[PDB]
Write a protein that binds this ligand. Sequence first.
Ligand SMILES: *[C@@H](O)[C@H](CC(C)C)NC(=O)[C@@H](NS(=O)(=O)c1ccc(F)cc1)C(C)C
Length: 220
Amino acid sequence: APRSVDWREKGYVTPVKNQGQCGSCWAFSATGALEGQMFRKTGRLISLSEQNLVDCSGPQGNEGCNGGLMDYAFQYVQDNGGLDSEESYPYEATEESCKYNPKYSVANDAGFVDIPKQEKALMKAVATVGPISVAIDAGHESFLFYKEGIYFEPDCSSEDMDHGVLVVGYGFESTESDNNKYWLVKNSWGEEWGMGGYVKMAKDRRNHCGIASAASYPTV
Ligand SMILES: *[C@@H](O)[C@H](CC(C)C)NC(=O)[C@@H](NS(=O)(=O)c1ccc(F)cc1)C(C)C
């Protein structure tokens, strides 16, 4: 792979969003990955509806504000034949009945790819595909309070992830030979969290916080 990647600079990434007090992280992770792949296919970046996924993707296994998986969201888009735009189907931070309208669909996918569970494969996918949906262990106050720099939490688990986010690139701080490496991660807690809503997460430390444990992207 390249030494560093940032897909924001290539037009693949919408602004940071805010899931509110709803356990819909998986929906924001899924729309981010689909936004990236639809841009790769068409050259147009269009913000996608998390509310459409929250309300409508139960049949694929999601549970609205009580949690879900990005792969189940990619399966819904395939099954349904579409996903509405954010503008047409705005986010309400609470589960409601399904109001999908095909007139306003702006995305589709034909399934998904699960990445092998290690960071060299994750890096290859980020470099060759675009932004990648991942699950991490975010369940520490250090993550809530993160401000800047490379996040490393001694008690992070590589097995027990609870929060879905989006890898948009990677790189290094300091001189290269220090191996001060990070994943560039878009969160869905608003731009006041973190570094404008982003976090750099420890890279190449044996899958810190599980970032390579449940990584995937949609096939468009
Ligand atoms: C993010 O907002 C979600 C918060 C949970 C506590 C509702 N996290 C998830 O949906 C996670 N998916 S899951 O399948 O692991 C899960 C975990 C705990 C739950 F209570 C429900 C579902 C995340 C890994 C996407």
